[PDB]
Amino acid sequence: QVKSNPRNNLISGQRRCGKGRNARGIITARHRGGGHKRLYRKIDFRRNEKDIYGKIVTIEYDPNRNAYICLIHYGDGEKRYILHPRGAIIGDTIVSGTEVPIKMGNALPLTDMPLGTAIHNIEITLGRGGQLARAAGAVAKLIAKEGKSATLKLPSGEVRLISKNCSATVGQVGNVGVNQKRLGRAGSKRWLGKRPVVRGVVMNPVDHPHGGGEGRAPIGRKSPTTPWGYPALGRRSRKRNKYSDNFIIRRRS
């Protein structure tokens, strides 16, 4: 399950370092920092190399995502990491291409997938790489296809059109029990480098729109507010007219 190997050439040390600091060096993305140094595994999300037969040699832990990852070999000696499908066991065999059996871990375009299939690691754009449903226990069903476009129900429940020629992988993403953990102590947050968050109501007026009323503050604001002055609850931020809109059918509920 989790047994450490030596380092395959897929594990490097190069990476952004200040987490949450941008070019100007400012904290843009709050609360990061601290936490264990990690190494970046190079996942193969495109699965683009066609028509060769891969074998799952092992199953490895990855610090950068909550899913698992699988080291796979080929007859050609090339080694790749793929996201670990749910139920795949060492000794298993996977392949990608157009005309392919449909089993766990095989990747194919959406033209060839029988409606009703449960899919993960879904490209939205030809050859851009897989994007949708990569997290642990994430899965999306392929409901209907018509014309040049295929329809999925994403793990958020949102139904959406994509191109019929975009690759995707059969089977759900493994390590389903991950959100069943209970961290149990503060330190165990910090280990993940998620630093402590202050409630608005606490801070001084300069610092945040729920600023200190004498003892304890009800939020007198006629509305719950972002640090930056926007309504906190139920105000849709989706860009009104984005190109995406023609594709999107039903919105997540």
Q: Where are the beta strands (DSSP E) in 124-252?
A: 130-132, 140-146, 149-153, 159-163, 167-170, 248-250
Decide: is 135 part of the binding site for Mg ion (CB under 5 A).
no
User: Which member of 91, 235, 241, 246 binds RNA (CB under 7 A)?
Assistant: 235
User: Which member of 118, 135, 217, 248 binds Mg ion (CB under 5 A)?
Assistant: 217
Q: Report the nearest approach of RNA to the CB of residue 170 (Å).
A: 16
Touching Mg ion, residues 50-69 (CB under 5 A): none
Q: Report the nearest approach of RNA to the CB of residue 103 (Å).
A: 21
User: Which member of 98, 125, 127, 148 binds RNA (CB under 7 A)?
Assistant: 125
Pairing, β 107-109 against β 159-163: unpaired
**Cβ proximity of 130 and 47 under 8 Å:** yes
Q: What is the 3-state secondary structure (H, E, C) of 107-153?
A: EEECCCCCCCCEEECEECCCCCCEEECCCCCCCEEEEEEECCEEEEE
Q: What 3-state DSSP class applies to 240?
A: coil
Touching RNA, residues 84-123 (CB under 7 A): none
Q: Report the nearest approach of RNA to the CB of residue 45 (Å).
A: 7
Closest-CA residue to 136 (of 171, 181, 104, 176): 176
Please give the Cα distance from 221 to 228 (Å, whole number).
13
223 binds, among RNA, Mg ion, none (CB under 5 to 8 A by kind): none
220 binds, among Mg ion, RNA, none (CB under 5 to 8 A by kind): Mg ion
Touching RNA, residues 131-190 (CB under 7 A): 131-138, 154-156, 158, 160, 175-179, 181-190
240 binds, among Mg ion, RNA, none (CB under 5 to 8 A by kind): none
Q: Which residue ranges make up the site for Mg ion (CB under 5 A)? A: 7, 197, 199, 212-213, 215, 217, 220
